[PDB]
């Protein structure tokens, strides 16, 4: 029942911790609630493509969902499916739909592999007490060389037919007097090159990215996570999520968790105890253990800065409907690889990424995922009743969100003669998709829940170190700023707690 650090989910900041613990000769245990996605499924594959969604994509749904923006093109391929272990969690609140990976690797298994450096200024304004040169001199260089980032070959983006879309909205972009920046990824793009001449398996140019690559993505089971199991000292168990944490009368802290199969079915419940305490359940899972413990009074030395802070990074999808003569082809890749960047750290900045459509046929639609400066932030409270965290924020508090997402592409709108699509958000006519995230960030925000390395106010041993660190918001796709930070964390804590 003891080991010595356990570590919740197998996420990016729970990633990185588990590494640098088993490097440094710590026995470590990863508990982590999804599944290790190694087992060939119904189609000889891992993971199921977009086009052809069955149970594996969701995480005990009984019917598929197409990928936001694309219902009027996938919703015909969708079908009822039994509750499963899938890899895509929907998690409803009262006016937000969070989007979170689950299974060994977390978010990384399901995202579009974007790793983007946030800008200095700004990662200074958010997190003023943190000391900016370590970050990018040592921790942010760190990250990319460990999450083996790359970048694409301009000659083969120019001509391959694959990335047609986005040079159509770099040209119209061009014309607003606005600039396109190219963005790093963990998806090899050798290997994407190999599957446009069709020499190697297609993953990301077969419509594959939201419920996993069976090719070409490095996730962190292949980086991280492979790196940690190659210490010697790290285990990892799956399908075991962690529902209580409690201190022991010595200091140490014992957990309980269930113990479930792929069908939901609960199989056993566990009691583990340990010295030290690593989270990694994301900006959701990690926030909601940590309000129960302090609200169900097992660890009732937590502060009142424990559940808020929380924020949806800005994010806000739209899109623009082309003209005739600018069609952004059938064939797009499932993989990002052109942004827009207009993040000048004032009310109206917005990062935007030109995303893929993956109807299959042409729509001379361009799709646009932006990421905008909004000081609304949302809160996590404990609801005793169904003893699950409730997320306070409503509809409204994306206004600003909207309104520079808005500035922006009206802009592109008037330089191009173009208009808005309204018809791809479900019903009413809505231009602008305002509930629903990608990137949840906060709920144990660094410096205010926790010291500013994570270590969770008013206990010792106990670490928090994924995106519910992060103040609600850093201007861009965050993975490479959870890992970075992750990075930074782990080693001052490694030299002067272990
Ligand atoms: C569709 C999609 C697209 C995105 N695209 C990008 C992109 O291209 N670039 C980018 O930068 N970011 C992207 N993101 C966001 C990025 O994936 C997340 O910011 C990142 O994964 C968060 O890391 P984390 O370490 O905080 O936690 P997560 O990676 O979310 O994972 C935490 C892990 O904890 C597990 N866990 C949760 N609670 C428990 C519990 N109680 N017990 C045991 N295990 C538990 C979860 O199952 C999970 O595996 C995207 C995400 C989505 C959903």
């Not at 009822?80 to 937000?96: F, H, T």
């Not at 997190?127 to 999450?147: H, I, K, T």
Request: net charge neutral.
């Amino acid at each position: 029942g003891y080991v010595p650090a356990v570590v919740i989910g197998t996420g990016y900041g729970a990633a990185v911790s588990a590494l640098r613990l088993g490097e440094a000769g710590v026995q470590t245990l990863m508990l982590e609630m999804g599944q290790l996605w190694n087992q060939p499924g119904p189609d000889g594959n891992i993971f199921c493509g977009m086009l052809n969604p069955d149970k594996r994509s969701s995480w005990f749904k009984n019917r598929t969902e197409a990928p936001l923006g694309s219902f009027l093109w996938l919703d015909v391929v969708n079908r009822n499916i039994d509750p499963y272990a899938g890899v895509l969690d929907r998690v409803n609140y009262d006016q937000m739909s969070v989007y979170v990976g689950r299974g060994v690797g977390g978010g990384s298994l399901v995202n579009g592999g974007m790793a983007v450096e946030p800008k200095r200024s700004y990662f200074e304004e958010i997190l003023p007490r943190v000391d900016s040169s370590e970050m990018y001199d040592r921790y942010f260089p760190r990250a990319n060389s460990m999450l083996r980032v790359n970048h694409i070959d301009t000659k083969w983006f120019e001509d391959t037919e694959w990335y047609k879309f986005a040079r159509v909205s770099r040209e119209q972009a061009g014309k607003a007097g606005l600039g396109t920046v190219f963005v790093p990824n963990v998806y090899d793009f050798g290997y994407m090159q190999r599957e446009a001449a069709g020499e190697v398996p297609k993953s990301a140019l077969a419509t594959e990215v939201i419920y996993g690559n069976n090719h070409g993505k490095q996730s962190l089971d292949k980086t991280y996570l492979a790196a940690a199991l190659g210490t010697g000292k790290v285990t990892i168990q799956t399908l075991h999520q962690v529902k209580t944490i409690r201190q022991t009368k010595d200091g140490g802290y014992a957990l309980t968790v269930e113990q479930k199969d792929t069908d939901g079915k609960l199989l056993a419940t566990k009691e583990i105890s340990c010295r030290y305490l690593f989270l990694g359940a994301g900006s959701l899972g990690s926030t909601e253990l940590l309000v129960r413990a302090r609200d169900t009074g097992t660890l009732p030395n937590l502060n009142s800065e424990v559940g808020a802070g929380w924020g949806p990074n800005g994010n806000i999808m739209t899109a623009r409907a082309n003209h005739m003569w600018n069609p952004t082809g059938a064939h797009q890749s499932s993989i990002p690889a052109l942004g827009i960047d207009a993040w000048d750290n004032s009310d109206s900045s917005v990062f935007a990424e030109i995303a893929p459509m993956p109807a299959g046929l042409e729509t001379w639609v361009s799709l646009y995922l932006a990421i905008t400066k909004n000081p609304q932030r949302g809160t996590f409270v404990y609801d005793a009743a169904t003893d699950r965290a409730k997320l306070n924020w409503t509809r409204d508090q994306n206004a600003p969100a909207v309104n520079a997402a808005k500035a922006l592409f009206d802009r592109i709108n008037k330089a191009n003669g173009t208009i808005y699509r309204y018809d791809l958000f479900g019903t009413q006519l809505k231009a602008f998709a305002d509930d629903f995230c990608y990137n949840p960030l906060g709920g144990c925000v660094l410096g205010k829940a926790t010291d500013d390395y994570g270590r969770v106010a008013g206990y010792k041993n106990l670490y928090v170190t994924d995106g519910s660190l992060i103040p609600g918001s850093v201007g861009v796709n965050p993975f490479v700023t959870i890992t970075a930070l992750a990075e930074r964390n782990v080693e001052r804590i490694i030299k002067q707690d272990v």
